[model samples]
Target chain A: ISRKTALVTGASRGIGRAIAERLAQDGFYVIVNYAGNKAHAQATVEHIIEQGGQASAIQADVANEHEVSRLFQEAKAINGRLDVVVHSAGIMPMAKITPESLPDFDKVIHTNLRGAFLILAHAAETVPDGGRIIALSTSVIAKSFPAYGPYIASKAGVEGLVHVLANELRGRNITVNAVAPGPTGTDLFYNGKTDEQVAAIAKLAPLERIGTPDEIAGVVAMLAGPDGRWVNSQVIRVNGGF
Target chain B: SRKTALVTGASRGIGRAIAERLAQDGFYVIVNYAGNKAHAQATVEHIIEQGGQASAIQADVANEHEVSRLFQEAKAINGRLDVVVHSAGIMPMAKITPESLPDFDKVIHTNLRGAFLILAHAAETVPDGGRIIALSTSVIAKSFPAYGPYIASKAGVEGLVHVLANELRGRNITVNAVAPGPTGTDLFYNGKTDEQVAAIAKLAPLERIGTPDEIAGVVAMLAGPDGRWVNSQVIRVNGGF
Candidate 1:
């Protein structure tokens, strides 16, 4: 049997890198797509290859439609078939909603919501029948955290996108879904926090600690693999009970 | 001192059973009603006779002014508010796709708009660390035929619950919703025969219709201390398939 090919965007560091690594371990020829982090992408590729898994580092700004298309073409060239597309290349601009910076609102929407749509449209056109597409959403869509209005709006749009895409791709037997992670232990979360502040943030979770990148990657791996075949159009929140 | 709870539509149905269960769970219950004063009073009497603190209050939960005064009067009586269980909902059996505009508006106003008003007031007046539970229907998930208006309004209520949960999270208060499947409530299942009820029950994964007491048990849990961690979630109490 041919090896399954998986394309993971933003797979340089953080949650995306963890997902790429996990998918590689799961026996997929992983294509680690990053925008400009060649060193980190190479590290991910090396780590996968060291584990006797197949991986290649590719550079692509996924928010750009042409770049995303090129990335899928590269995946097709690499493995002769693309089976999974994980759209995780997005930015979270932590800016308060104000009249002066409304353009920042549009930027967040462009990167998070519209970018996912572009990736999905391309995946629908390119990925073979019975493939899978998963988008990384945020738990803040439900939590509605303060100063996260723009991000929340975009993710809400993503939720609607998942629902519509699930119906649109039903005939093709493709499953489209999203995974929303709550306050994970990433630099994005601890952007300006001290040790004590981080401890307090960790304590806020019902599980009494912030989540790890690997833990979230585990969920993404399940969704991309065969185990999550039946689960479609759902936003599975891996927040450990917020 | 433990705070008081006021549940509307409490008579001989889900409301009555919920009021009884909450009282048993050590809440000072206020069984509210629009009519059925005798049944409401009987519920209070039963709670009192069973060593639980409770009384009957009369008000139309769908009416803004009445609901406003209902909360004001409850605060005056108990001196503190801890929980508001908005279980008073109406499901008028009508073909929604072709229903009259006024009829659809009535259901939306009663179920959706009324819930918004109640929750807005709860956020304004209820003490910090309070809990608000809304009674939504599982049909919103299943979207059974002919219940279009009812399901749409309830879906609106579900959306409201999420927004309010975040809105009130700053106060450490949690707003959640409990969606129950087909239950033996007189409000909707009064005239259905055994065969009809069994057919409805079989539609659910549990293969049986739920009891008023069982739903009340869920509401009681939400109002109690054990469910504090569960916020901004719609816990569906349908039996496992």
Candidate 2:
């Protein structure tokens, strides 16, 4: 009963998968949340179990409130407690702010912004006092580029809610913070980037390379562990000082 | 016997909301407005009617003399001022490529220069264990056109807030900014068309214009004790954007 449980959303692949694996290694029984790609989600769970860590997969669109609520209902049935909720499920479609591309803009907001809110709100309600609430943000919030309108705006609002939610959950001893990775090597990041474009983004970080998903996972591990208890209401940027 | 809070541009909208919320939080509130004494006084009366301690003070935050007088007068109220919320800012949008010097000058003066002056006095006037907050716009993170001047001013405000938080380190005073996105205020909706408004509101995960009270809830947290450790950070309070 004393074993802590960490719920990592979007754990099928990429940073979310990395986080689920890392947390499982840290001795928490993991609940992997995925939108689709059942094969990838199962692979993550199988890898964790093969490593002698316990984890399983659950499917739910993060933007759907009822589905997210039910996802928690399933999580609670396991051990009747959730200690950490890592909200890493988000979408980044590059679209410039334009009247014609309004649909694209709306799609990004719905999947990224609204999806994050529902997930975080559910975590806030279900997670016990003294638990951790970590969300994924982007370091691009520090600057802007053409066609990044929807992504930047959505994460910007995310940074806002992180602080407000921290204040809201004060007495519960719960800590609310976020992880903002600059440009990591993942399918989500490589969807449209050419070799030259990838190189250009790699140069943005002081390390002169794109961050690996494991690097971001290390950050999530730290925040989910006892060491990160005092680091509240902050977005720890794990982008090689980008 | 209560702590004192000075809120700039408290005549209407978000500022008024912050002034009222802080007054209700047991602070001796000072409602500071640049113009419209009647509105400022009405805020004072409203707080008083709620059995809270409050008064109104006038100062054009852009002027050094006025800002100095404002802070000094606020300090004079109870011999101590603990929280200063610099919500006094303006957002006049214009294309930077076209070089609208008038629009550019007005924004830089009121938002940037005024913020510097107000924050300088707050750093000096506020006692140890005090709080200082500035209002900034989250749209600075977005590179939208015609937003150059406004974003620049707000971007500078955020820079100042970070630097001030560092300067006040040993003093135990925390400086931060609440950068709100698409709120239902005249400051946001004045030049925006209905279509534009609806379009922007849906950008957030919340998919709606945030009420002034929602923004005030954030301000109240920083001014309160739970927010003591949140220093040198610009909190973007938009729904998701």
Candidate 3:
């Protein structure tokens, strides 16, 4: 397990950070990938190193094809075998067609939806059979929310991608799955909302609270590791009760 | 606050049993109907005579105006709405390849479009944290033969539920659909004799046709508090068929 390597994208903060930390603690040498937050990525690596876990920060924009390739190549050079790949890199921008921010819509689709396909194409070719590929999705696919049109559409595309890839990877024993987390209280959660608005949002669930980032990461760790081997081609939603 | 619920198609079938069970679990009930007014009224009278709250409402669920009026009248009488169980659906035997386009449109309009209209109103009117549920058939999963049009329409209902659940998110509400396997509803077993029913029953792992009340039990669970986290999931309550 010490020699095993897990590559996690968008590892700078929020749910991605928690997943990277958890996977490192679970005994995998983690390659934490971040787009711009080198300081936060270094903090994550230092935290893992303090706990006796092997980790290194790798900077790459996953939406860029060349950068994605270099990211994987760096992983292969550091560790000969890649056992897991968690594509937590995504952007959720709020802009409804009421005003129609075309750039915002395109960026969300390009990063959240198309980026997964780009990474999966390369990962499928490079990663050995029987390895795991997990993608982060949103629970809003079940319930669409206001100002989430672009994000929800993108995640819906991810769900379709999961089904297609699951069947495509069947013979190779490689399982592709997605975890859809409900309204989680991450930095991104409060991005477009005021304190009062956030508080009101928390009351929507039967649980009467928003989900924690650690909870979402816990589900990601399960899928990335040995326990979720049999569960393939499924999207597990981790929303509290909302 | 405990409120009233109205389940249409409620005479001696899935609707009857759901109405009875929801009443037993303490809800002011309205057993609705289009033609079988006597049986529908009888279901309400029985519930009332049993010391439960209930009444009969006559309206065809397929009629958009009638459905809206029915909901308005029910709300006026109860002063509040808590749950809606759309168990009213039709299964016409027709092959997908050659089914009449009008018949196909009718089924899709009734089962899928009608459901969306009802849900849109429910979302607009039901208080925050309210629950809305629709009844779908498990054949949508299997896509069985001689039921192609029915299967396609139910598939549309399945899609509708997902979108509605998400559309109403953050309203403190949860929307879901319960799909039961070939149960012993009169409409389901209309042309089948005992032997045919038995043979169909044997197809499931349970080796028996499910009672309407059994399917109602699932509906009640969803309407209750226990099913909060289980949102946006189309739980198939088939006996592992």
Candidate 4:
């Protein structure tokens, strides 16, 4: 157990996978946690191994309370400890703010908001002193577009948890923060949006395009590493000046 | 033809101040109270004594049925609402843990879920040019321990404000939040030591806690005719705290 361990939820693909691979490349033993995609999770682990990094895949439904609790224990047992915990498992379902839309709103909250609460609660207890905790939020919170009420509401709550957990772990060397990404090229981002709609969003940012998954992972790596030691209880927006 | 505004939780403190101020601004103020009808009456009298129009209305913001009736009555008076301000919320302290889930649920039900219901109804009830405002706290930035539930609820409310603003696009309505920091209110003073009060007062560069009237002034500005362009934002009126 000489190598420090990092657990990244939803690491089977997208930004979560990027964060997983990057952490592994940075010398930590990565535990890739996926909700249901065992094939993708194994592929992520195989890629890490091929790159001369150690990684393994674990399956757990983050929204399930008991499963998330067990997930932390399993992750810790992999390399005897968890040095970093990143919760990137979330869903983005669009719905208007109407009484008729309450079901969709609740579904989003159940997966994103409630899942963050469970993950943060367990991570607060599991991650030892000097460890790092990160949650994924969205920069779309500022846009407030129609049909995004539930998704934005959930991410906003996650950011709130990041701040509270940071203060709760005061005097410990641990740091809690969130990484809010703008429009990134991911299945979650492209879900239900036509190419025309996506292009309009891509034009909103000064960078004039959606970000790569690696771009978002770069910030997560910075936060999990030593140089980010001083940044605490903050939400870093990686939105390319959007 | 007087404009009508509904101010939830107007029995005392910041809500009452906003109710009285809105009355003074020449809007017929519907002073909403969850409990303690007597305080609601006192709020109404305070406005009437100052030659302002106000009436007491009973409603539990956390209850959808009550909130629905409250808005129905609010619209019936003037045939439409010109402004809607949701100031009803609780600030109980609790950590983020399984043990604190009950407290967290209670706070979320009142602060965040209540905001959703109010905003949803306000969306349908407020005329095209009307304004909608919710009370948030600047402490979301502070992230103090035991303020977990409160912060989460207010943060979620801020999110809802943004979405509602975009959802109401082209309707000429402005959805925004007024976040106050360490204001001199019963809510803030409750369970806090005198030293704690003094410490929080000094946290702000203003070197003192804000008065309810000062907060009401900002809400008055938002609800007034000049605030037409200010839409979909959280205006922190905390003296740079």
The regions of model 2 sitting more than 4 angstroms off are A1-242, B97-99, B186-197
Model 2 accuracy (lDDT, Cα) = 0.83
| All candidates: DockQ | 0.04, 0.02, 0.05, 0.01
Better of 1 and 3 by lDDT: 1
Q: Pick the candidate with the highest lDDT.
A: 4
What DockQ was computed for model 1? 0.04
Model 3: per-residue Cα lDDT over A1-242, one tens digit each: 33878888888888888889889888889899998859989998999889999999999888888988898889877878788888888987788876558889999888988888877777777667768888888887766778889999988998898768767664566768787877777786788799899889787765466667787787677667644444456676767545
TM-score of each candidate structure, all chains considered together: 0.54, 0.57, 0.54, 0.51
lDDT (10s digit) by residue, model 1, range B137-169: 767766677688788889998999888876664
Global lDDT for candidate 4? Answer: 0.84
Q: RMSD to native for every prediction? A: 11.7, 13.4, 11.3, 17.3
**Higher-TM-score candidate among 2 and 4?**
2
- Residue A175 lDDT in model 3? 69
**Superposed Cα deviation of residue A145, candidate 2 (Å):** 28
Could you tell me which residue pairs clash in candidate 2?
Answer: A153-B241, A157-B240, A157-B241, A160-B236
lDDT of 4 by residue, B24-94 (tens): 88999999988889999999999999999988899998899998998888888878799999999999999
lDDT at residue A10 of model 1 (Cα atoms): 84
lDDT of 2 by residue, B1-241 (tens): 5799999988898899899989888999999998779999989999999989999998999999888788878898899999999998877668976569999999899999999998999989988889999999778878799898889898999999878866775576778888776668776788789999988765553355677776787788678754544566676666444
lDDT of 4 at B77: 86
* Clashing residue pairs for model 3: A143-B165, A143-B166, A144-B166, B10-B15
Lowest-sum lDDT 10-residue window in model 4 chain A: A226-235
